[PDB]
Curated annotation (Swiss-Prot), chain B:
Assembles to form an icosahedral capsid with a T=7 symmetry. The icosahedral capsid is about 60 nm in diameter and composed of 415 major capsid proteins. The assembly is primed by the interaction between capsid assembly protease and portal dodecamer, and major capsid proteins assemble cooperatively to form the procapsid with the help of capsid scaffolding protein. Major capsid protein forms hexons and pentons of the icosahedron. Viral genomic DNA is packaged into the procapsid through the portal vertex. It is found in: Virion; Host cytoplasm. Belongs to the lambda phage major capsid protein family. It comes from the Viruses. The lineage of its organism: Viruses, Duplodnaviria, Heunggongvirae, Uroviricota, Caudoviricetes. This is Major capsid protein. The chain holds residues 3 to 49 of 341 of the full protein. Homomultimer. Interacts with FI protein.
Length: 49, 47
């Protein structure tokens, strides 16, 4: 804060401030999915008969 | 080495194959588009 150093002593020296780092590197996602080429033979729920 | 041999026509050796069925009875060919293959034969019999 400041507290009260008297005008007869030098006083203490404050450490200024600062210093904080961090890392958040990798991440990933990959939704592979199949087309199923033999699924197209039968009738889909759509595509009215 | 030093031969210089010229070659004429070569044989074929086709063993034996003559269908006679895909050329006398199965003259009609239609492709598919669906899973099922229907084949009807109406029983024609009139009085």
């Amino acid at each position: 804060m400041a507290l009260y150093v008297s005008p007869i002593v030098s006083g203490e020296v404050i450490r200024s401030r600062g210093g904080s780092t961090s890392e958040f590197t990798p991440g990933y996602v990959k939704p592979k999915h199949e087309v199923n080429p033999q699924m197209t033979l039968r009738r889909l729920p759509d595509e009215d008969p | 080495m030093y031969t210089t041999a010229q070659l004429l026509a070569a044989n074929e050796q086709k063993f034996k194959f003559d269908p006679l069925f895909l050329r006398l009875f199965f003259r009609e060919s239609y492709p598919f588009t669906t899973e099922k293959v229907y084949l009807s034969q109406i029983p024609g019999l009139v009085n």
